[PDB]
Design a protein around this nucleic acid. Structure first.
Lengths: 129, 88, 240, 123, 166
RNA sequence: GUAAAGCGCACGCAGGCGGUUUGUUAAGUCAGAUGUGAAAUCCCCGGGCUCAACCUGGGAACUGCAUCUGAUACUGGCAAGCUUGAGUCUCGUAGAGGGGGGUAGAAUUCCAGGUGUAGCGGUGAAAUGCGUAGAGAUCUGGAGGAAUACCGGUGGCGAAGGCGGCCCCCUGGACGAAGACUGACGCUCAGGUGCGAAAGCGUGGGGAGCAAACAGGAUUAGAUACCCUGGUAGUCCACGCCGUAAACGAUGUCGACUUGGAGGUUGUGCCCUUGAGGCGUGGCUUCCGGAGCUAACGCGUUAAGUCGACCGCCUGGGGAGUAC
C-alpha cells in the first residue's frame, strides 16, 4: 500500500496549500526531518515541530505570501524504482536558481547551492516550480 | 466459520502455550481448520464455484504466512508443515 | 468599528432556519444543526464584521454617492430608511443587465425618464386623444418601475451595498469589472465567496435584516459628515 | 504508463512516409511501356487525360502521367519516370520526364525548360 | 484602464480576422470577428476577442477586451526566470529560462508577437492544437506565476516571500 | 469515460518496488585518487597558399572505458523490533452471493361431465388460422410445466458481467463492536490455475405458454425487411464442451490525501430518542457544489482532483477480429 512516502508527504503539502490549510501533519522519518530543515531555512515551509515518544510524527506550516499559494507544486524526481543521480559537475537548475533541488549527498541533506559549494553529487530528491 | 470447541483445542495445541490466536503458527492452524471445514462442503456441491473463490483467499494467505515463518525460524516451520500434513 | 460586536448578538438570536438545506461554502460560520434547523455561529462572525466597519469609515471621506442592491420584500423598508434622500440610491425592482458596464444606455434612459416626468407634471401631452397620452404613459411607467430608486444618480458609485447575493449575482460581477469594493450582508444559503467584506447573517426575522444594515449604514454617513465639517473649518479659519 | 512498463514492452509509432513504390530509395526509375491509356478522372470531372502503364525494372508495374500537348510516347519504349502523385486520377503516383529517353518536349511550352523537358522553347 | 499596466501608446497587435455566418433566417451575416493582443514590452496578460458589423468597430471592441481587468506582469524587459508549463484548451507550451544571446526562430507573425511579449528567449515550439486562436497563449498561462530577479540575494528570494506571509 | 485505447473478473509465482527504527554490510550511489583516449578535414586557439575552398602544430567532443581507497544522506542485503501497513480468535448485524433438498395456488392450456349458441382470433384496416364432430366463454372437479408479479426502495448483495417465489441442509464474502494477539508477514502482477449475462450444445428427464426456421396470410413501384396467424428446436432441470459480448464506473488494482451540506439507509453510544430527525463514530448509497482537471458533456472527498507503486492497452481511415 505505502510505496513512496516522500511523494505522499509532498501531496499532503500540495493539497494543503491549494485548500488554504495553515498546517499539515503526517508520519515523520530521519529523511523527512533532513528535508524539512532545508525547506525551513529556504522558506518552502515556515517552521515545523517533530513530536511523538512512541514513533516520531511531523507537523509543518505551509508556504504563502498573502494566504494562497506561491509555489505551485513540489514533485519528487528521484523515487522508488527510478533513482536519478547527479554528479558534482551536473547539479540541476530550477527556475534559474530562484528555486531548489533538495539533494541528499553522502555528507547529508542540503540544497543544490551547498552540494555545489561542497563539491559533491548525490540523489536529487524533489524540485520546486 | 468454525466450532467454538475445535477453535479452543487448536489454540491449546498450536502457536505458543499462551493460547493466543495471532502468531504465525496458530494462524496457519486456524486457517487450515476452516479450509478443512469448507472442504467438507466440497465433499458434495461440485458446481458451487462462487464459494471456491473464498477457499483460494484462505489458501493463498496461508502460502504467504508459510513464506514468512520460513523467512524467520526453521524449527517452527519444519514442525508446523509436517504437523498439519500439508503438501506431498 | 466597535459597533459590530454589540450589534451581531442583539440581532442574531432568531438563529435563521432555512430547514437543514443551507450552503456548504458558508459552512465554517454555520454551527451544527439542532433537529433539522440550521443555527448560525455568532462568535466567528465578529472579526469579519468589525473589519467591514473600519473600511466603511475610510470610504466616507472618499464618497459623495452609495448604491444599495440585493433588496427583497422583507428587506425593502430597511433599505429605504438608510437612504433617506437622493444622495443615496437603491434598486429593489430587480437588477437590469449592464447597469454599471452600460451605464451609458442606462443613464440615457434615465434622462428620457426625468425629461418625460417633468413634461407630464407641467401638463403638455395630456391634451388630445387618450391613445396619444397613454402610449407615453405606458413607456414612462416601464422606465419609472425599472429606474425609480436610481433615477437621480449623478455618477458611477464609489461602493456597492449588498443585503442578499441570492438573486443578485450580476450586480456584484460588473461592480468587480468597474473596480468597486462590495460591502456585503450574505444569508445562510448565500456563499461568502467573491465579495470584498462579508457579514454572515440569515434571511428571516425582520428585526435582524434591519440591525445588520443599521450598523453598516451609520459608519459611512456620519463618517462623511465629519469629513465635510473638517472641510468647512480649513477655509473659515483664514477670514476671522 | 510506467518506465518499467516501457522496459517490458517498447514504444511503436505511426506508419512511415511513402507514396512512390520505386525501389532502391531513388526519385527516378526506368521501365518499358506496357499500355497507353485514354482515361477519365476521379473526383467530379470530365477530361481526357493521358496515362501510360510502365513495367519497371523491378518487375512491378505503375501508372505515370503524360503532361502537356503534343503526344510522342510509343507503347513499347524504354523511358525514365519520376515519382510525383496525381490526385485527379486514381492511384497515379508518377509523371514522365519529357526530356528523357524516348520522350520529346511539349509544343507551346516555354513555362519551364527543365520542367516539362523542352530544349530552347517556342512561343 | 482599471488595473492595466503602465502602458503608454496603444499596442495594435491585430493577430487574426475572420467572418462568420449561418445564413439560415434572412440572408448572410455581414459582421466581422477580430482577435487582438495589447501589451507594453515589459509583460502583460492583455488578450481581447471582439466583433462588430464591419472591421473598424470589430477591432476597437476586441482592443477594449484586450486591455480591461488585466493584471500587471513583472518581467524585466527581455529576461524571465520562472515560467509555467503552459496549457490553454489543449494548446500546450513549455518554456524554460534561457540566454537572449542565442536568438529566436518562430514562424508566421509569431517572432513579432513574442518580441513585444518580452518572452521570446525562454520560448520553445508549441505542441497540442496549432489553431491560430490558441497558439499565441505563450505570454498568458506560461507567466501566470513568475518572477525575474536582478538581485544578488536570488538564493534568499523564496525566503523573502515567506517572511511576508509571517 | 466517450476521439484509437482499462485486461471479463478474482487469486497469485517470476520480475519490479518497499512504512518505520536500531544493529550491520556496502551491490547500486556520490566524492577522492590514478590511467587511458594519435591526427586535422568538424570544434577552439594559432599558422600558410592573392583570400576562400584547401591543408595543418597546440587544445578538444578525442564522441569510448577502468578500478582502488573514503562516505553513509538515499535504495539493495540481512537479524531482531516498532505500528503506522497488513493478518486472526469468539460475538453481533445487513443482504436477491453460491451449491443440493422440500412446497402452494392462479390465468393461458388440456380433459371429463353439466349448462349453452355462432363466431372466436387478429389489426393501421385486413386476411390466413381455429370452429357446428358444438367452438369461444362459463360451473364443478382433475391434469400438467415454466414462472412467482406487488413487498421491489435513490435499498442490499456478488469478483466484473453477475444475483429476486417461499422455506431448510451445506457454506463464502462483506458491515460493525468489545476483550486479545502477531508485528511489513507489504503492493502490483507477464506466464499462470479457477470461474458464463444470453443463447449455441451431447444424452436422459420434461413441455403449459412464447418463438428463429418452415408454411400460409398482409403490406407495395416490389417486399426476404415491415405487420399478422399457425409452428419446431429452444426456453426448464441434471450432468457435460471451447467461457462470448455493450463482460459497466463504456472508468485498472488496491492504498494515502483534499472547504463540505444534505438525501437514502444500517451497526452502535447519547436525546422530552418525539419531524424515515439531532449529535458521537464506522457501513454501503445519492443529490448539490469549492479547490483542481477537461474539447465538451462531465467528474469533485465513492474523482474524471493531488498523488502512490506496479500492470494492462492505444498510435490515421477503408480493407480485418479476417489472413498467418
Amino acid at each position: 500500500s505505502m510505496q513512496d512516502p516522500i511523494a505522499d508527504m509532498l501531496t499532503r503539502i500540495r493539497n494543503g496549500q491549494a485548500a488554504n490549510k495553515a498546517a499539515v501533519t503526517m508520519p515523520s522519518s530521519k529523511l523527512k526531518v533532513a528535508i524539512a530543515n532545508v525547506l525551513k531555512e529556504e522558506g518552502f515551509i515556515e517552521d515545523f515541530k517533530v513530536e511523538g515518544d512512541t514513533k516520531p510524527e511531523l507537523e509543518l506550516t505551509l508556504k504563502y505570501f498573502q494566504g494562497k499559494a506561491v509555489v505551485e507544486s513540489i514533485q519528487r524526481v528521484s523515487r522508488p524504482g527510478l533513482r536519478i543521480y547527479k554528479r558534482k559537475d551536473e547539479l540541476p537548475k530550477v527556475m534559474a536558481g530562484l528555486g531548489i533541488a533538495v539533494v541528499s549527498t553522502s555528507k547529508g541533506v542540503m540544497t543544490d547551492r551547498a552540494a555545489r559549494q561542497a563539491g559533491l553529487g548525490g540523489e536529487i530528491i524533489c524540485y520546486v516550480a | 466459520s468454525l466450532s467454538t470447541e475445535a477453535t479452543a483445542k487448536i489454540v491449546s495445541e498450536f502457536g505458543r502455550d499462551a493460547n493466543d490466536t495471532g502468531s504465525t503458527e496458530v494462524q496457519v492452524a486456524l486457517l487450515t481448520a476452516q479450509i478443512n471445514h469448507l472442504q467438507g462442503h466440497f465433499a458434495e456441491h461440485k458446481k458451487d464455484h462462487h464459494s471456491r473463490r473464498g477457499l483460494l483467499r484462505m489458501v493463498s494467505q496461508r502460502r504467504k504466512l508459510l513464506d514468512y515463518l520460513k523467512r524467520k525460524d526453521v524449527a517452527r516451520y519444519t514442525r508446523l508443515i509436517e504437523r498439519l500434513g500439508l503438501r506431498r | 468599528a466597535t459597533v459590530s460586536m454589540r450589534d451581531m448578538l442583539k440581532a442574531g438570536v432568531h438563529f435563521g432556519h432555512q430547514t437543514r438545506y443551507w450552503n456548504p461554502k458558508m459552512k465554517p460560520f454555520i454551527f451544527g444543526a439542532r433537529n433539522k434547523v440550521h443555527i448560525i455561529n455568532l462568535e466567528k462572525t465578529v472579526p469579519m464584521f468589525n473589519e467591514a466597519l473600519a473600511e466603511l469609515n475610510k470610504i466616507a471621506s472618499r464618497k459623495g454617492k452609495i448604491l444599495f442592491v440585493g433588496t427583497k420584500r422583507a428587506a425593502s423598508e430597511a433599505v429605504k430608511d438608510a437612504a433617506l434622500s437622493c444622495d443615496q440610491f437603491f434598486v429593489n425592482h430587480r437588477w437590469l443587465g449592464g447597469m454599471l458596464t452600460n451605464w451609458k444606455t442606462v443613464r440615457q434612459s434615465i434622462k428620457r425618464l426625468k425629461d418625460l416626468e417633468t413634461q407630464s407634471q407641467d401638463g403638455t401631452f395630456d391634451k388630445l386623444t387618450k391613445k396619444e397620452a397613454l402610449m407615453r404613459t405606458r413607456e414612462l411607467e416601464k422606465l419609472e418601475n425599472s429606474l425609480g430608486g436610481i433615477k437621480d444618480m449623478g455618477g458611477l458609485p464609489d461602493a456597492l451595498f449588498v443585503i442578499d447575493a441570492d438573486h443578485e449575482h450580476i450586480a456584484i460581477k460588473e461592480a468587480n469589472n468597474l473596480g468597486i469594493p462590495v460591502f456585503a450582508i450574505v444569508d445562510t444559503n448565500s456563499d461568502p465567496d467573491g465579495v470584498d467584506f462579508v457579514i454572515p447573517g440569515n434571511d428571516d426575522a425582520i428585526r435582524a435584516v434591519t440591525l445588520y444594515l443599521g450598523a453598516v449604514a451609520a459608519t459611512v454617513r456620519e463618517g462623511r459628515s465629519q469629513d465635510l465639517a473638517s472641510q468647512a473649518e480649513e477655509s473659515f479659519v483664514e477670514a476671522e | 504508463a510506467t518506465v518499467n512498463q516501457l522496459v517490458r514492452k517498447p514504444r511503436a509509432r505511426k506508419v512511415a512516409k511513402s507514396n512512390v513504390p520505386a525501389l532502391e530509395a531513388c526519385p527516378q526509375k526506368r521501365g518499358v511501356c506496357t499500355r497507353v491509356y485514354t482515361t477519365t478522372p476521379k473526383k467530379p470531372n470530365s477530361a481526357l487525360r493521358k496515362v501510360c502503364r510502365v513495367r519497371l525494372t523491378n518487375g512491378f508495374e505503375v501508372t505515370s502521367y503524360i503532361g502537356g500537348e503534343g503526344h510522342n510516347l510509343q507503347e513499347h519504349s524504354v523511358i525514365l519516370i519520376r515519382g510525383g502523385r496525381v490526385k485527379d486520377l486514381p492511384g497515379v503516383r508518377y509523371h514522365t520526364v519529357r526530356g528523357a529517353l524516348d520522350c520529346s518536349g511539349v509544343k507551346d511550352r516555354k513555362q519551364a525548360r527543365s520542367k516539362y523537358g523542352v530544349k530552347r522553347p517556342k512561343a | 484602464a482599471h488595473i492595466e499596466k503602465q502602458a503608454g501608446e496603444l499596442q495594435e497587435k491585430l493577430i487574426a480576422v475572420n467572418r462568420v455566418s449561418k445564413t439560415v433566417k434572412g440572408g448572410r451575416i455581414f459582421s466581422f470577428t477580430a482577435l487582438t493582443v495589447v501589451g507594453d514590452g515589459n509583460g502583460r496578460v492583455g488578450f481581447g476577442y471582439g466583433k462588430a458589423r464591419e472591421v473598424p468597430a470589430a477591432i476597437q471592441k476586441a482592443m477594449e477586451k484586450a486591455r480591461r481587468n488585466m493584471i500587471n506582469v513583472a518581467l524585466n524587459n527581455g529576461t524571465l526566470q520562472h515560467p509555467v508549463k503552459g496549457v490553454h484548451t489543449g494548446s500546450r507550451v513549455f518554456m524554460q529560462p534561457a540566454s537572449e544571446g542565442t536568438g529566436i526562430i518562430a514562424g508566421g507573425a509569431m517572432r513579432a508577437v513574442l518580441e513585444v511579449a518580452g518572452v521570446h528567449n525562454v520560448l520553445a515550439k508549441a505542441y497540442g492544437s496549432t489553431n491560430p486562436i490558441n497558439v499565441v497563449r505563450a505570454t498568458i498561462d506560461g507567466l501566470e506565476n513568475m518572477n525575474s530577479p536582478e538581485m544578488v540575494a536570488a538564493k534568499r528570494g523564496k525566503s523573502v516571500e515567506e517572511i511576508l506571509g509571517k
